[PDB]
């Protein structure tokens, strides 16, 4: 059914990907420095500051997006901006794209570790990363757009 492929993100993908977050909570989980409503400009700003922006495609549709927000050659990468089209949630897109990013971190950055940080309210993410072999290492305090304290669960996984 799901026949996923991947390639580097392109300008022509921005409007699609900027359509993915469906509410302020979803935007905060995947891009906590963004301001609702999301926009192509905000997405392009991230892409410029980051590395490895990659889309996942199925049946001619861009269904996922991810990048690295930290990269340290021979050391680790940290995954962020993981977004999935609302019509394709729970179909394997995030897990597919995390595997692609793991490979890119190993191959291009010679990373030994991938870091993922997940906000506490994002249960789906915490469970998914757990299923993929990520372990929690620390919890950091952050604040949401209403000034409320949230917990950022910092996880990692050795790259094999
Ligand atoms: O789907 C969710 N989380 C996934 C888990 O991998 C991920 O964190 C995510 C976050 C934002 C998003 N988006 O805004 O399009 C999509 C997936 C929760 Cl919003 Cl239920
Ligand atoms: O700033 C620009 N380009 C950079 C890369 O040089 C990047 O693509 C970017 C785009 C939009 C942006 N924004 O509007 O926040 C920030 C950076 C153009 Cl607006 Cl000139």
Distance (Å, whole) CA 85 – CA 17: 7
Range of the domain at 101: 1-160
| Binding residue numbers for acetyl-CoA | 82, 84, 90, 92, 94-95, 122, 127
What is the domain-level CATH number for residue 76? 3.40.630.30
Per the structure, the count of domains in the chain is: 1
Computed over its alpha carbons, how large is the radius of gyration of the chain?
A: 15
Long-range contact list for 89-94, CB < 8 A, 24+ apart?
A: 91/2, 91/63, 92/2, 92/4, 93/2, 93/4, 93/56, 93/58, 93/63, 93/64, 94/64, 94/128
Tell me which residue of 49, 48, 112, 117 sits closest to 79, measured CA to CA. Answer: 117
Q: Say if ligand 1 is within 6 A of residue 34 CB.
A: no
What DSSP state is assigned to residue 98?
Answer: H
Distance, CA 12 to ligand 2 centroid (Å)? 15
The residues near 88 (Cβ < 8 Å, ≥ 6 apart) are 58, 61, 63, 64
Ligand nearest to the CA of 35: 2
Experimental method reported for this structure: X-ray
- Cβ neighbour number for residue 32 with a 10 Å cutoff: 16
Sheet with 51-58, side-by-side order of all strands = 5-8, 51-58, 61-72, 76-84, 113-119, 149-158, 135-143
């Amino acid at each position: 059914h799901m026949q996923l492929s991947h390639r580097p993100a392109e300008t022509g993908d921005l409007e699609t990907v900027a359509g993915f977050p469906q509410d302020r909570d979803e935007l905060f989980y995947c891009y906590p420095k963004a301001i609702w409503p999301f926009s192509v400009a905000q997405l392009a700003a991230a892409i410029a500051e980051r590395r490895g922006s990659t889309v996942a495609v199925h049946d001619g549709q861009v269904l996922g997006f991810a990048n690295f927000y930290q990269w340290q050659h021979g050391d680790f990468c940290a995954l962020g901006n993981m977004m999935v089209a609302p019509a394709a949630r729970g179909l394997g897109v995030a897990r597919y794209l995390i595997g692609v990013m793991e490979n890119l971190a190993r191959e291009q950055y010679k990373a030994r570790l991938m870091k993922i940080s997940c906000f506490n309210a994002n249960a789906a993410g915490l469970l998914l990363y757990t299923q993929l072999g990520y372990q929690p290492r620390a919890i950091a305090e952050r604040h949401d757009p209403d000034g409320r304290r949230v917990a950022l669960i910092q996880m990692d996984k050795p790259l094999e």
